[PDB]
Design a protein around this ligand. Structure first.
Ligand code: NA
Ligand code: NA
Lengths: 280, 281
């Protein structure tokens, strides 16, 4: 699996993902607009949060990361741009954290910076919800490095793998820091029960996994669902890829039973993630 | 008509096969946490206080029957905090009583402050907020999904969509988020807080609960039961579906054995203890 690649399938799978979204989601992703002042505030807060780790990060790097939030959130339904900036900052600094050598992970310096971001942008209750989700996420990543649990869950079956990824891909965290953006009671409850995360995990993870496969297997990373099939066998791969598209479609069609605003947000997230993933 | 279907022809054989599966795959027999008379009386007093604003009188016998689920399903070897344990006893019991009420009588303005009072009595400041939020989210979910098209979609589409809904709906995320203070075990605490603990144990709990509640639930039009996804009046179709559900339980148990020893003891004691309590009452 160390020298395997999905490169033969890259164009066809991209085309098929886009065809699926065009058929099943229809509504095209749009990019949330930040003013120059708002982007500056976001970048200032990102830099302050990773400064204690000695990180200098370029504006260009921060802006590439924040594009995920601008594309994946749902601009029609935004009601709180302070929460929106918080998600921009939290997303960005977690990306930088996840790219660092783990041996330099100083939780004592980083967790208080996450808390500071949450207390700046959210009300008291929401700040605790967002902070706990951020804490749980980065703590999980640390716990499962070389854990037998990760090996068991990621190699047993797609169901066990996606069960691990509800947390490990970050979508529970994303939902629990994003609901204040929308101030929509139903969405808030689905975020807090993690049903929102459970409904969107496969569509986010399958896309992310396909486009990270070559890099991740080159680094010995096992958290990728395409490791569960023999990608070098075109027949096995196409069968597995179709099964994953079927998973995404079943989730999308189930999401359409949610209330209109919630379904818009869930579907914008899955489709926006795909656009951002393929653009950068 | 599914409203008249029954799993009664399969009751004995399925009970035997569940027990055979647990004997082979979990091995360690459930044991009952012991409560002193004083501790049991404190639990019952707090249960009665919590539901008194609703005008509910409940008998000691009824509370003790509910308490038994916690005494059987928790893991006595690993207990470190019996205050947390009493909290789970009280929260389990009052939630059972709430769920058995006519929903027309659900006064959240009266009930939620009583849950908060319980949490603040028995837990530290941080844990009290975690347990209360999970209790709040659970009872709020029940309210918002009554007659919801989301419930219909998730519960009729596939077993995977159904179990995704039941991670919350059957209460196991709530259970884990009020139970981790019992054990003060850092790994378990994190699995409870990420809800991986709930996701690992949902199928084993739900399949057992669904099997023994089927006749009751279908007679009331309740759709939250995985055996509605098969034709239980066709023996061949039922046996195939039941085996598939047993396979799900086994795959989860075998995966749970990859967790650290204390965590896996707690997870497996929960699934197997739930089955013992379910069949005894
Ligand atoms: Na968008
Ligand atoms: Na037990």
């Amino acid at each position: 699996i160390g020298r395997s690649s999905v490169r033969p399938y890259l164009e066809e799978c991209t085309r098929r993902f886009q065809e699926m979204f065009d058929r099943h989601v229809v509504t095209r992703p749009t990019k949330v607009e930040l003013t120059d002042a708002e982007l500056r505030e976001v970048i200032d807060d990102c830099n302050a949060a990773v400064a204690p780790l000695g990180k200098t990060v370029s504006d260009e790097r921060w802006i590439s990361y924040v594009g995920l939030v601008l594309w994946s959130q749902s601009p029609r339904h935004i009601k709180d741009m302070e929460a929106f900036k918080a998600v921009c900052v939290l997303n960005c600094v977690t990306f930088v954290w996840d790219d660092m050598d783990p041996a330099l992970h100083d939780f004592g310096l980083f967790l208080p910076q996450l808390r500071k971001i949450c207390e700046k942008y959210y009300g008291p209750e929401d700040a605790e919800v967002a902070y706990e989700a951020a804490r749980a996420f980065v703590t999980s990543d640390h716990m499962f490095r070389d854990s037998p649990i990760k090996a068991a869950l990621c190699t047993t079956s797609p169901e066990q793998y996606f069960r691990f990824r509800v947390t490990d891909i970050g979508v529970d965290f994303w939902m629990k820091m994003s609901y204040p953006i929308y101030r929509h009671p139903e969405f808030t409850e689905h975020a807090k029960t993690s049903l929102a995360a459970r409904m969107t995990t496969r569509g986010l993870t399958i896309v992310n996994d396909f486009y990270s496969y070559d890099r991740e297997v080159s680094l010995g990373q096992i958290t990728n669902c395409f490791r569960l099939c023999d990608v070098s066998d075109e027949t096995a791969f196409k069968e597995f890829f179709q099964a994953r598209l079927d998973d995404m479609i079943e989730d999308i069609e189930c999401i359409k039973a949610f209330d209109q605003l919630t379904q818009d947000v869930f579907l914008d997230l899955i489709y926006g993630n795909f656009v951002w993933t393929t653009s950068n």
